[PDB]
mmCIF file of C-alpha atoms (C1' of nucleotides) and ligand atoms in Angstrom:
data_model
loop_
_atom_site.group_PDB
_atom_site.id
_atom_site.type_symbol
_atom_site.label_atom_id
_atom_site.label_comp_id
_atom_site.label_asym_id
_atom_site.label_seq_id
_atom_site.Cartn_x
_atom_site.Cartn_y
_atom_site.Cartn_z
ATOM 1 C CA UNK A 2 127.921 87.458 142.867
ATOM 2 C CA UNK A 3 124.686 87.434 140.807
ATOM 3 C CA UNK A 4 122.924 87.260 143.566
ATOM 4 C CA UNK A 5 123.546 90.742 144.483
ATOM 5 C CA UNK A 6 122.615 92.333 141.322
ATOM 6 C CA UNK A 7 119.741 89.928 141.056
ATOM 7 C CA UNK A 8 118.425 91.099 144.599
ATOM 8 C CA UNK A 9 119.680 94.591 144.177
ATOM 9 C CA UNK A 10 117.097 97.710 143.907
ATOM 10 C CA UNK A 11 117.570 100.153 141.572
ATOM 11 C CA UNK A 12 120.608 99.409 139.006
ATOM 12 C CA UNK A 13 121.646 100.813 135.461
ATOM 13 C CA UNK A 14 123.001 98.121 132.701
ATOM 14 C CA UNK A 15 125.526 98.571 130.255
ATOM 15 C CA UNK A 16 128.761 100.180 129.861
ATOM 16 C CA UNK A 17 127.907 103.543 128.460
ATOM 17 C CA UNK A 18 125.068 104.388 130.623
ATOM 18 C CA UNK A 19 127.036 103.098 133.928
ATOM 19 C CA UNK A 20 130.138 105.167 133.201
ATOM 20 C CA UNK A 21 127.516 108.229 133.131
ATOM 21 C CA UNK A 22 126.155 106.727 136.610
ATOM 22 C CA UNK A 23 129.344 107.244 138.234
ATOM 23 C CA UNK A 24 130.144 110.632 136.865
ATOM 24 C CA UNK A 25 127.338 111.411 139.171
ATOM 25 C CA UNK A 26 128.029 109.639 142.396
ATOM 26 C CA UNK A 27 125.006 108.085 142.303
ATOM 27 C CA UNK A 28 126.770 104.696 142.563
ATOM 28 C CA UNK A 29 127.206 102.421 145.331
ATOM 29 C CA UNK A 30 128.768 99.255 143.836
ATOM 30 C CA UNK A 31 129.816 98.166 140.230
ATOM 31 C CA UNK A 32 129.559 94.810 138.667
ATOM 32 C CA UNK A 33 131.686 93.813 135.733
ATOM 33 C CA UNK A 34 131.846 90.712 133.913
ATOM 34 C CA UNK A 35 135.449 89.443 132.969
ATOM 35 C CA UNK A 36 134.806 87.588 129.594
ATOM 36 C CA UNK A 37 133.636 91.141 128.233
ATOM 37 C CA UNK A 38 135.891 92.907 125.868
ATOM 38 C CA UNK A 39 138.603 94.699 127.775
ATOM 39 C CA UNK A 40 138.713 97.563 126.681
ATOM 40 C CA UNK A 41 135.160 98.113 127.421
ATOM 41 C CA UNK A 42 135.316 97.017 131.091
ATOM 42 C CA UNK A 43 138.495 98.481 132.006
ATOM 43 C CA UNK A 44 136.848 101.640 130.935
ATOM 44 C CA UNK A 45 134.565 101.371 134.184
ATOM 45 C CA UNK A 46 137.103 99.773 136.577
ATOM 46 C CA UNK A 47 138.833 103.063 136.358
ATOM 47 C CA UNK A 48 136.385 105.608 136.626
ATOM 48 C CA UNK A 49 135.501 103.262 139.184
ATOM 49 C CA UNK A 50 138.350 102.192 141.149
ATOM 50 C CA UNK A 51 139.562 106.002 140.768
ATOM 51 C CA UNK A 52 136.466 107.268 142.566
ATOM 52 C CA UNK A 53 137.216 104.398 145.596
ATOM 53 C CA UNK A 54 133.854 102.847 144.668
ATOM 54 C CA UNK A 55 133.691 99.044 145.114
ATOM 55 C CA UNK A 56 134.256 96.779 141.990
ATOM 56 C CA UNK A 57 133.125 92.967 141.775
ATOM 57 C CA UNK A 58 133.678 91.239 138.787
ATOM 58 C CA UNK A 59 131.658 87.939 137.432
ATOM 59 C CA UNK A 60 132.783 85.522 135.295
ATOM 60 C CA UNK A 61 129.832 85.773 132.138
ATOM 61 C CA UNK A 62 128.464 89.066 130.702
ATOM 62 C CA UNK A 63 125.725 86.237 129.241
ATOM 63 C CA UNK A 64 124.634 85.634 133.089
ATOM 64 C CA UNK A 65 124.930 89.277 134.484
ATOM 65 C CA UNK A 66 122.243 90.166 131.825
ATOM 66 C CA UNK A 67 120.273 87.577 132.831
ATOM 67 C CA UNK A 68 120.426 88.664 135.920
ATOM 68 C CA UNK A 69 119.476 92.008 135.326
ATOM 69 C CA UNK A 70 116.830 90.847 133.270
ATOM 70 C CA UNK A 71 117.878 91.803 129.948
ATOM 71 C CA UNK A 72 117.680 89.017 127.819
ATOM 72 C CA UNK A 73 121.254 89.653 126.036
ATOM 73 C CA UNK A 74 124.059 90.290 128.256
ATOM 74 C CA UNK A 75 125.864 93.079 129.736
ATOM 75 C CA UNK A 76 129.273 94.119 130.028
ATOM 76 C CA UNK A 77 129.142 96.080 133.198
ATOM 77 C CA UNK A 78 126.333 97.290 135.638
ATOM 78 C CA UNK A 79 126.192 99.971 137.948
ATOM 79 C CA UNK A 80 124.095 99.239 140.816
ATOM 80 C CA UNK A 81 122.163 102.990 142.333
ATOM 81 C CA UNK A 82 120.998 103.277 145.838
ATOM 82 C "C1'" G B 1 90.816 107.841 107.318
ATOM 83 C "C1'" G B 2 89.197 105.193 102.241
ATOM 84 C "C1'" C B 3 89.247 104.061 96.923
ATOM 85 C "C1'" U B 4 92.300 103.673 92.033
ATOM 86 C "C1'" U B 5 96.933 102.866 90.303
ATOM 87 C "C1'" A B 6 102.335 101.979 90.067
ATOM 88 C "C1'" U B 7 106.341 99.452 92.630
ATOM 89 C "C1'" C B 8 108.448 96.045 96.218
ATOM 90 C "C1'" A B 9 114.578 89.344 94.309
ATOM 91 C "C1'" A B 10 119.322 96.083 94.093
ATOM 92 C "C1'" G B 11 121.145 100.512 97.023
ATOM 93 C "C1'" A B 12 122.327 103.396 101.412
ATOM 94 C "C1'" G B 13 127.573 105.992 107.832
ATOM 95 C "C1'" A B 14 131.544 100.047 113.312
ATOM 96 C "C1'" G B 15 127.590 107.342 112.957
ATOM 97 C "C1'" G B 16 125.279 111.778 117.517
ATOM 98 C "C1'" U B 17 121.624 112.037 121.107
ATOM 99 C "C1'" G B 18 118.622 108.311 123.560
ATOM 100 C "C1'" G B 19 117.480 104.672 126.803
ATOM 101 C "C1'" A B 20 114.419 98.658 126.487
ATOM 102 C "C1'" G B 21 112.733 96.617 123.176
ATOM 103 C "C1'" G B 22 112.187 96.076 117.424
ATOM 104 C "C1'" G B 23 111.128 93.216 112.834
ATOM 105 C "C1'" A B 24 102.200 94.879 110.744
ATOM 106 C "C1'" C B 25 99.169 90.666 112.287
ATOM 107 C "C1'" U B 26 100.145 85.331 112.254
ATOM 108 C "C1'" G B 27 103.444 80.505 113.743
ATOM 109 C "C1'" G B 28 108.586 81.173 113.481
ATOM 110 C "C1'" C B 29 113.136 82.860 113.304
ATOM 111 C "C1'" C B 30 116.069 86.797 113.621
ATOM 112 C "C1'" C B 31 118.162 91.906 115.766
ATOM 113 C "C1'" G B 32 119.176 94.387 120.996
ATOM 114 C "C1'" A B 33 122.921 97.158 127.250
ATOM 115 C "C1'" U B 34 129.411 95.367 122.614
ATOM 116 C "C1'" G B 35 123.006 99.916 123.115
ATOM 117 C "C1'" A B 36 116.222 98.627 120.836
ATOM 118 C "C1'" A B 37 112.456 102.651 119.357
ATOM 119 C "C1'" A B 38 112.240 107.893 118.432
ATOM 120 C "C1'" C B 39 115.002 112.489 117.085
ATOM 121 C "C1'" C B 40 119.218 114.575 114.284
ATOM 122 C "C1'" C B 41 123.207 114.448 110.971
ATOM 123 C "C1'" G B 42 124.790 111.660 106.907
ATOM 124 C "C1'" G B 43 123.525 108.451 102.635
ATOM 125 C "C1'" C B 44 120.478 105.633 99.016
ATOM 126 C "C1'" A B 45 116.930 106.141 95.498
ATOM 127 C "C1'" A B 46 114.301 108.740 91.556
ATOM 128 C "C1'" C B 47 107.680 108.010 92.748
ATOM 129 C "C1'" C B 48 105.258 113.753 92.299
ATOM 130 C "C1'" A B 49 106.264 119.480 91.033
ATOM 131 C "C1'" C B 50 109.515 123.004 89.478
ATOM 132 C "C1'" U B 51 114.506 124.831 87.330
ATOM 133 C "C1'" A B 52 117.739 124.620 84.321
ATOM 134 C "C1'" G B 53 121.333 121.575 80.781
ATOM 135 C "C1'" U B 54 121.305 117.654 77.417
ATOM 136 C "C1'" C B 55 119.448 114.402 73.253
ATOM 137 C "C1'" U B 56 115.373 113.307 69.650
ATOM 138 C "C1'" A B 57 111.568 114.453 66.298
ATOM 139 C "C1'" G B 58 108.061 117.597 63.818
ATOM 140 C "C1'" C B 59 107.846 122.483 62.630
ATOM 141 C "C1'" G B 60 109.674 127.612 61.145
ATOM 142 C "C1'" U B 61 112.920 131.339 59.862
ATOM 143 C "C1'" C B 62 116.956 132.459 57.953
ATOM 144 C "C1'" A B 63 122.094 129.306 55.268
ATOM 145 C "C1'" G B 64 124.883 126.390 52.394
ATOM 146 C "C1'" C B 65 124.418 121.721 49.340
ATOM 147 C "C1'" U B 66 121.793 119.372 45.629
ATOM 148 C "C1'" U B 67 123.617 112.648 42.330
ATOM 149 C "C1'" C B 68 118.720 118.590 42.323
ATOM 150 C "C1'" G B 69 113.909 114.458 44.286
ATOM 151 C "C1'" G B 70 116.124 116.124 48.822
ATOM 152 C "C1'" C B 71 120.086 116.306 52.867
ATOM 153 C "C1'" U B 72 123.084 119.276 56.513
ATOM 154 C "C1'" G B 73 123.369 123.601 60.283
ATOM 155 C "C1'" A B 74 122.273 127.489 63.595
ATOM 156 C "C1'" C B 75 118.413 129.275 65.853
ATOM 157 C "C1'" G B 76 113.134 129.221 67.850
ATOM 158 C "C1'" C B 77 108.926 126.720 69.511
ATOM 159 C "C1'" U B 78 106.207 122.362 70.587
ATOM 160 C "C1'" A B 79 106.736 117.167 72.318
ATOM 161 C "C1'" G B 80 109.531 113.340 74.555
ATOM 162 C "C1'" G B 81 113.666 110.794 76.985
ATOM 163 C "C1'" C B 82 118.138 111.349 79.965
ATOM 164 C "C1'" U B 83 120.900 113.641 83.646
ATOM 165 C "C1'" A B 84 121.586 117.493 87.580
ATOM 166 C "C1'" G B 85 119.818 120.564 91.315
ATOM 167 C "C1'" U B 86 115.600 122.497 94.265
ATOM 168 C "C1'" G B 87 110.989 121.303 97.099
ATOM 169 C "C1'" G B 88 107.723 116.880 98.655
ATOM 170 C "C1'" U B 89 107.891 112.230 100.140
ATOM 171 C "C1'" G B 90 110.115 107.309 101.124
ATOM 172 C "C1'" C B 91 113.886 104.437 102.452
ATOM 173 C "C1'" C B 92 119.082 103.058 105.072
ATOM 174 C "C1'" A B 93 119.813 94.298 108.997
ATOM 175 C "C1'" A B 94 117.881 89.822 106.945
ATOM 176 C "C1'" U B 95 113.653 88.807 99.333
ATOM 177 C "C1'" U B 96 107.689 92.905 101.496
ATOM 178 C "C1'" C B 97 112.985 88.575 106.881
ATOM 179 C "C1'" C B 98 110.062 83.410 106.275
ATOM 180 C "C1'" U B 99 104.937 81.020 106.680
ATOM 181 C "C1'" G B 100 99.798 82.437 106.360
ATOM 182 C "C1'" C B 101 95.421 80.231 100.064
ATOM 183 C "C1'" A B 102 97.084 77.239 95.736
ATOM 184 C "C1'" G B 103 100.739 75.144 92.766
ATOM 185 C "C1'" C B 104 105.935 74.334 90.345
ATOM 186 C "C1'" G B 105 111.374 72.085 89.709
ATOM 187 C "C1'" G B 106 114.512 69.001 92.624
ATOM 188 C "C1'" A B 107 116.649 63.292 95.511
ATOM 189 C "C1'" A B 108 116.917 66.650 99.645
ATOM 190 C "C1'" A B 109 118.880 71.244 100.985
ATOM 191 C "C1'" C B 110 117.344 74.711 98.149
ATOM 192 C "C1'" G B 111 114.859 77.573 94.114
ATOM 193 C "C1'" U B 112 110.310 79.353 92.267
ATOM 194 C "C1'" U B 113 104.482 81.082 90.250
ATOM 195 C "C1'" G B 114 100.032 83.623 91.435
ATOM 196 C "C1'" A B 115 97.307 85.160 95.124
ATOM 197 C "C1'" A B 116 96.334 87.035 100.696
ATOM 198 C "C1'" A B 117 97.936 90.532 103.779
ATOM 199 C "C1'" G B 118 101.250 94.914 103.973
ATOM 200 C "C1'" A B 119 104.394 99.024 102.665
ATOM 201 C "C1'" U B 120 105.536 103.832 99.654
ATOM 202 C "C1'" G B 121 104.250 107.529 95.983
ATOM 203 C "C1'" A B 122 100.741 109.923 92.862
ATOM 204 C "C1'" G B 123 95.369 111.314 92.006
ATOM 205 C "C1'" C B 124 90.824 111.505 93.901
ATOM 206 C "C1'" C B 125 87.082 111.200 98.547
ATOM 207 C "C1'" A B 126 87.171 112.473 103.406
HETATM 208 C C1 SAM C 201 108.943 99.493 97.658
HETATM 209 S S1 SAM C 201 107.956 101.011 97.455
HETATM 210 C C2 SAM C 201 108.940 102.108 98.539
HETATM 211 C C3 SAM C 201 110.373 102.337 98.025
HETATM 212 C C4 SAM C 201 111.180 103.245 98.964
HETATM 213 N N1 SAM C 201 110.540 104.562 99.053
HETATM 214 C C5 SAM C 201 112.661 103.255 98.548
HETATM 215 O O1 SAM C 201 113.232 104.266 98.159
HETATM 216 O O2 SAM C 201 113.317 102.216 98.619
HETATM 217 C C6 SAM C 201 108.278 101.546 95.763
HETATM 218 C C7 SAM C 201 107.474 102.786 95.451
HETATM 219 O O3 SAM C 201 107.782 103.839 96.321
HETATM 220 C C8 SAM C 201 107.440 105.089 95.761
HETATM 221 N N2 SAM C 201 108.563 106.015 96.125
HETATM 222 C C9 SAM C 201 108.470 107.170 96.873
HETATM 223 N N3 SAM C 201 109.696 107.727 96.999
HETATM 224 C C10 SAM C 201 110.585 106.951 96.339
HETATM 225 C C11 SAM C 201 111.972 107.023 96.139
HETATM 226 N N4 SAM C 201 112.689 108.017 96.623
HETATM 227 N N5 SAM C 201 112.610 106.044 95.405
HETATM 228 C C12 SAM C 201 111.907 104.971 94.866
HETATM 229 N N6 SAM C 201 110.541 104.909 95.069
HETATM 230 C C13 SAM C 201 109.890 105.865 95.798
HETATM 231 C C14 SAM C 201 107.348 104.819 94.253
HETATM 232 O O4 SAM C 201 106.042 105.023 93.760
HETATM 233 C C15 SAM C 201 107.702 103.347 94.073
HETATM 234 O O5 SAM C 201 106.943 102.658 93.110
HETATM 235 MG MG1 MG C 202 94.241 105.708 112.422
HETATM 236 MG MG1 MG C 203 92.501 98.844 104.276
HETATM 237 MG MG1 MG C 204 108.104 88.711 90.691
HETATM 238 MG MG1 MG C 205 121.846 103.389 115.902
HETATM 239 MG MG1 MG C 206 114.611 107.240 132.071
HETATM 240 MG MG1 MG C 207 124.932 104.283 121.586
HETATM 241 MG MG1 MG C 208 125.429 111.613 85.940
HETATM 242 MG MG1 MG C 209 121.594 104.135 108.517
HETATM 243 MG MG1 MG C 210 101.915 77.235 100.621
HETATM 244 MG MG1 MG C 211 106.396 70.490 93.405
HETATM 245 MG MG1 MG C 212 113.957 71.094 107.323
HETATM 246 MG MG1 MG C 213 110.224 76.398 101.201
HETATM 247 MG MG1 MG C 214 97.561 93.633 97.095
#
RNA sequence: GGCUUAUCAAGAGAGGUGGAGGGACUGGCCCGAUGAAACCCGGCAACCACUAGUCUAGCGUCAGCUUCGGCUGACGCUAGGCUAGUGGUGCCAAUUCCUGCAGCGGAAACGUUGAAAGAUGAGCCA
């Protein structure tokens, strides 16, 4: 669901950056786009999944930027609050 | 900050940190969360100073040679080029990424000349 990320409050982008989100608790849900290389998003569904924190997944990393409002395209975003 | 001048069609880490924009302006078109700028490391390059080493020439002192005018050698100095380190910069996607004013070749794509406007160094002025 776009929607939720689009709609969401506070929220980091990117793989890197997220993965250093949850090594803080500081997130609530995590949004991963399936088309993204693999072994960049499985990277987060296990640091993830592992800490019991929700995981959706979205079919385009070209849409999750976009609604996120980079203008390129993310892999994975964390979403804080 | 400005002026003068030189250069700008090559080269340079799938790096660390970092976090959202960058490529001057211009109209584009590129690059960016598969990670922008900045900082660091690393590299490219050789513009300024210095340090050597190297080559060249003139010159000198000694030394041989002399087909006797003159060559050759070591060494020293002066001068210059090259390379290698220091220190100072700069630079590390796309020709100065393309257009910006005016032309050139070509059938077009594309290639190209000079400016304009920038960028960097050096020397001055601030
Ligand atoms: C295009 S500009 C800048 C070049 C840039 N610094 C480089 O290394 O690619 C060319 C001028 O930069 C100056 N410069 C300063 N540092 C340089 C360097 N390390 N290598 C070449 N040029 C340099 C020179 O005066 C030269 O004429
Ligand atoms: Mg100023
Ligand atoms: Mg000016
Ligand atoms: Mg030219
Ligand atoms: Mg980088
Ligand atoms: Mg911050
Ligand atoms: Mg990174
Ligand atoms: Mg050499
Ligand atoms: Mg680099
Ligand atoms: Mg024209
Ligand atoms: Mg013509
Ligand atoms: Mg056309
Ligand atoms: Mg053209
Ligand atoms: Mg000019």
């Amino acid at each position: 669901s776009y929607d939720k990320v689009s709609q969401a409050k506070s929220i980091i982008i990117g793989t890197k950056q997220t993965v250093k989100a949850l090594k803080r608790g500081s997130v609530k849900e995590v949004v991963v786009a399936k088309d993204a290389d693999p072994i960049l998003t499985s990277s987060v569904v296990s640091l993830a999944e592992d800490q019991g924190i929700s995981v959706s997944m979205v079919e385009s990393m070209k849409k999750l930027g976009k609604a996120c409002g980079i203008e390129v395209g993310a892999a994975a975003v964390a979403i804080i609050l």
